[PDB]
């Protein structure tokens, strides 16, 4: 996947 962040 491109252009996607991460939340924790």
């Amino acid at each position, epitope marked *: *996947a*491109v*252009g*996607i*962040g*991460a*939340v924790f």
Partner: antibody
Amino acid sequence: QVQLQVSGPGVVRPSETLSLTCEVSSGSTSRDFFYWSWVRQTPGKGLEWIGGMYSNSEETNHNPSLKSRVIISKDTSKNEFSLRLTSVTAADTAVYFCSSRAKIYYSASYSGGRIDVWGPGLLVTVSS
Amino acid sequence: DIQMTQSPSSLSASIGDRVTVTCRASQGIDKDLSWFQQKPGKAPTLLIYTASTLQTGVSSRFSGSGSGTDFSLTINNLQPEDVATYFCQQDFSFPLTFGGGTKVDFKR
């Protein structure tokens, strides 16, 4: 303003600079980062991804059809994710959206999921 | 660039019908394909991601399949909230691109 709600002028004259802002927020942990995107919708061309950036960085990704007219920015001080479209023409009349994309790594028992949310759009018309 | 062709452009169906929209990428997009639902005045809402993963909160009446080049969205027990436009979104590479969209309309 709700999350990812777009604000700015609804009418721009041709050759002028469309400028929009988008309501964004920080994550709940200091490690959280989102991918913020400008997308637009027209009747004929449908949906078109204008460009985007990570909240982490200063780098921008673009659509090759628009890249040299697009300035994508952030101002955390005002909780703003901004688009500036220069050299605007009538072809740029559209509904403009913001989207936020992030993978979910909350836990060893909840992971791999994702958030991909769009806020309410704003109609911007280009005419004199 | 990578473009997604959706079929059919329009679809009319009855309550309870199983309906299918198809999308293909101009290249392999291995699994990086999402399905969105858009009601007329609203913003698109995520239904499926990674081509088959149902997003939390979306009814299991929506299902997704496919890989590589060919993908499908299926709505099984069609309900009044399903009248909308449905788009596929490729997130395999920049720029992100969308299918032309499919309207689901009610037979009468």
